[PDB]
Structures are given as C-alpha cells and as structure tokens.
Specification:
Residues 21-105 form the DEP domain. The protein has 105 residues and is mostly helical. The chain has helices at 8-23, 43-56, 66-78; strands at residues 41-42, 83-84, 100-102. Helix 2 (43-56) packs across helix 3. The longest helix is centred in the first third of the chain and has 16 residues, at 8-23.
C-alpha cells in the first residue's frame, strides 16, 4: 500500500458536508402551480438547509452568514453536486431567490 493524501483535513470537511447535504432530506413540499416540476426544490430553501447545516458544525460555526452559504453553494454546482432542473452543470453562479434544481445521474 501507499499513503499520500493531499489536504486530507480540507478534503474531509468537504466530504462530510457534501455527504450530509446530498442525503439531507428526501423531498420538500414547495409551491407549484404547474406539473412540469415537483420533485425539485428552489435554491432558496436549500440555502437554509445547507446554511443551518454549516453553522451547526464547529469549523464554520455560527459565525457563518447566509451570504457565505450562497458563495459556498457556487462550488457545489461546480463540483457537479447539484444539477439544474433543465440539466445545466459546471457554473459558479447560483441565486437564492428562485431557481429549480435537481440531483444529477
């Protein structure tokens, strides 16, 4: 065997969070008039689910503010953690106002 991990500390955190987020909740009931979508969720809602999850930890602590959440989220989409409803992945631009997202495959 051979041991040679890089930034294990940082890597661990990311994995931990991503692991909790990915699973988090199965589905959420959001306002929707049309049927086109339903199993998706607006970015906003996520901001909280993730934000709270971040502060809960010690690394981020309660010092982390909503703003930080949106900034970090940008990385998630870039890392292919969350794909848009249509199927657009690979960007660092994510709003917390109104945007339908979905899990990739």
């Amino acid at each position: 065997g051979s041991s040679g991990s890089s930034g294990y500390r940082a890597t661990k955190l990311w994995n931990e969070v991503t692991t909790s987020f990915r699973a988090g909740m199965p589905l959420r009931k959001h306002r929707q008039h049309f049927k086109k979508y339903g199993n998706c969720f607006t970015a906003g809602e996520a901001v909280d689910w993730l934000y709270d999850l971040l502060r809960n930890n010690s690394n981020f602590g309660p010092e982390v503010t909503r703003q930080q959440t949106i900034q970090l989220l940008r990385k998630f989409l870039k890392n292919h953690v969350i794909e848009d409803i249509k199927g657009r992945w690979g960007s660092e631009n994510v709003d917390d106002n109104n945007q339908l997202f979905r899990f990739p495959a």
